[model samples]
Target: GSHMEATKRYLCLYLKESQEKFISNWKKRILVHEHDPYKNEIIKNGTHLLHVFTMYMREEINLQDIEDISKKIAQERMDAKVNIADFIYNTNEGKKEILNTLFLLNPTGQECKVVIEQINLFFDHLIYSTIYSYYKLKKEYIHSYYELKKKYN
Candidate 1:
């Protein structure tokens, strides 16, 4: 068996292209502080984003794992933010600020975290599903092509 290693690598490249195509081309560059309704939106919408992610990456990983990975990415992003830029993002003597002073009532703290989680999770889901379906499709196409080539020519 070829074991699909080469095919899998090819599939990964396909996914990278897709990400670059979708994310980079879709959104504007963040010139200043970005705003989103991540926290409230997720808190309100409940499982919509969850389903969006799970449906996309259903083949590569489990739903719970995707949900957890989304949250984990949030933690890691915040940690990295503090690691690289404490002056702007980091607050207090030892503890980091979770909520923004601006959106204390409307609230921008966990919202940022949820945005990060959703963004990265969806990115991962796209990669997973694209690679998964691409490999399967290509394998079948290759067989069909070879058979047709031999039969017709």
Candidate 2:
């Protein structure tokens, strides 16, 4: 009856507590360029993702907040010329890591189902917005490539 808010809060608390493990797991599982800013950038971006999830759970942010953050991050990566496939794979890894932690929380029956669905809702919006923005920026990049080439020649 009254367990819903507590369950959601615990999920958020536990997820925040697991932040370091998330980074370690992320470092171990994902292959990325080892040079200079690449490694740090991946970790920084991953932390931004974690922050948004935590913020959303606390009701300090909403879907539109998630969308805006995702889009901005996407544009940043696109500007960096990062590989979208690698970024997506890293994101999948982050999602799986969070799920694994949530599974340990051991919420049963209704709470379990509710938590799972709620988490999925957040991730789905995040992934969609990021990819949508990334591709949108990529299209713009292509058009500019030709335009600049023509302008120069």
| Candidate 2, 1-153: lDDT as tens digits | 654547778767876887787788778887586543445767887887788888877778788787777777787777666577777787888888887877777767877788778788888888888999998988888887856557677
What lDDT, from 0 to 1, does candidate 2 have? 0.77
Candidate 1 lDDT over 5-123, as tens digits, reads 23223323433445434233222321222233232332222223333433443345444544444443344333333221221121121011111211233424564454435445555
Off by over 4 Å in 2: 1-5, 35-38, 147-153
| Residue 110 lDDT in candidate 2 | 78
lDDT of each: 0.36, 0.77
User: TM-score of every model?
Assistant: 0.28, 0.82
Candidate 1 shows a clash count of 1
Q: Which segments of model 1 are wrong by more than 4 Å?
A: 1-109, 147-153
